[PDB]
Ligand binder design. Structure first.
Ligand SMILES: Nc1nc2c(ncn2[C@@H]2O[C@H](COP(=O)(O)O)[C@@H](O)[C@H]2O)c(=O)[nH]1
Length: 240
């Protein structure tokens, strides 16, 4: 059964820090599409390889160390997604916070980004992602600096965020969400308990993300702003 497999896969050194829901979700899908030789586990296993960062413990240790030495920048350099948004990082948050600076932010599929949020003087942050290694790095930090930050090992496709806040960050995620389960991308924005959200898509290869996002955004949402910064096309929207 699935629970047996989830248990085996989570035993591996390569996947032990993975959100159990994700492994299960993927196990379940690789089953109905196969009925398998049993080794659905293989399809799932190689599906989980690039389901997360493609994030090695090696980079993780390197981060929590870089971090413990005060070098936040480098810590961020050790995470792929954050590393490329690094150069135009400040321009990016000025764009986002320009109109209203949030007290509580909900960083969806946060990654190491929360660190960048600390250095922005954001008071409260709730971040979720599918790899425990991430929280392992940011929590001791937040603790060591009495910064109100909470990490949830959670897959937004099994359960949406139950938290509330002023802003929600959905950076380069909608595409991966939509590809895993049609219509789930917008469904995520609909269930986010925030009046504002910062969404983004990669500029490089919904061939045209702008045309898709703009074309499929629910009428309850409005686009207050749009701009490209570095490798991201950003959209500031408001939920009503
Ligand atoms: N919470 C959540 N995170 C996900 C899900 N699928 C992928 N991710 C995470 O989302 C991120 C992809 O965004 P990025 O790091 O490029 O900005 C990765 O950190 C990855 O592990 C999901 O279904 N739920």
């Amino acid at each position: 059964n699935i629970n047996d497999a989830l248990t085996s896969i989570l035993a591996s050194k390569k996947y032990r820090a993975l959100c159990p829901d994700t492994v299960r979700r993927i196990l379940t899908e690789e089953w109905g599409r196969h009925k398998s030789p049993k080794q659905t586990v293989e399809a799932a296993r190689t599906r989980l390889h690039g389901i997360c960062g493609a994030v090695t413990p090696e980079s993780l240790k390197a981060a929590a160390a870089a971090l413990s030495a005060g070098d936040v920048k480098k810590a961020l350099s050790l995470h792929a997604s954050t590393k490329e948004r690094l150069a135009e990082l400040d321009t990016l948050y000025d764009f986002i916070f320009s109109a209203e600076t949030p007290r509580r932010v909900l960083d969806i599929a946060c990654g190491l980004n929360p660190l960048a949020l600390y250095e922005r003087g954001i008071a409260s942050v709730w971040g979720c992602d599918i790899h425990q290694g991430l929280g392992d790095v940011i929590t001791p930090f937040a603790r060591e600096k009495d910064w109100d930050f909470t990490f949830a090992l959670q897959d937004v496709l099994c359960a949406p965020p139950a938290e509330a806040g002023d802003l929600a960050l959905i950076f380069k995620l909608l595409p991966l969400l939509e590809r895993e389960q049609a219509g789930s991308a917008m469904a995520l924005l609909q269930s986010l308990n925030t009046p504002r959200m910062a969404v983004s898509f990669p500029t490089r290869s919904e061939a045209n993300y702008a045309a898709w996002f703009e074309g499929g955004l629910p009428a309850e949402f409005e686009i207050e702003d749009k701009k490209t910064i570095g490798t991201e096309l950003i959209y500031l929207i408001k939920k009503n």
